[PDB]
Amino acid sequence: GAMGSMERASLIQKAKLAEQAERYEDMAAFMKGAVEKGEELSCEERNLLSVAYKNVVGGQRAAWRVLSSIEQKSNEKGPEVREYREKVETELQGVCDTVLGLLDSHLIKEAGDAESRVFYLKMKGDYYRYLAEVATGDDKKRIIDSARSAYQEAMDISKKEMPPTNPIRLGLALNFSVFHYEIANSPEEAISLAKTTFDEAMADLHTLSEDSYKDSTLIMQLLRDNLTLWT
């Protein structure tokens, strides 16, 4: 595509510049260009891909929720609120389909190490989750199953291959727990997964260095914040 003429190293360098400039649409276009070079991503490069698209879809999701709330109020006027909510929805769907397409071409297929495979399957679950947030009816059921499946494959590798404090494993469990609570209408599964994840990580903190301890405890605090909200 449009980044085909740029060197892979220049795309990564410009993604970092775009992050510093808070230009996340540019950051995502540069990282898409880097993925489309066909080579595997390093840990740092996977992080850049995730930061870029999380910030782009996060603005879309925030805007969709504001518009959905106004639309719900207006149905308790004209077609304009629905049309504009639909416009933002379609743009958000397009960003999710773009990320899913990168994961399917061919990041997950080539990812053999647990840290890369769990990261990408988690991201697959997250973007199907964002599709599920705006989906209705039977469409919704198949999208929810696609999220659940990706998260479950990621969970099964993470429990076999990573210690319970590994930040990737922790963030997966955090997000799968949010899936269960908000998407799958399974609050008890959400609370059980957050509590078991927190308790198993607590028992493994003794093994960590100061820096690894700070990384793991930061994510554990998010689990605790959700358990406080839910119980």
Binding site: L174, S177, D225, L229
Partner: peptide, 7 residues
């Protein structure tokens, strides 16, 4: 209120 997913 919405729960925290990974930041």
């Amino acid at each position: 209120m919405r729960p925290r997913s990974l930041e």
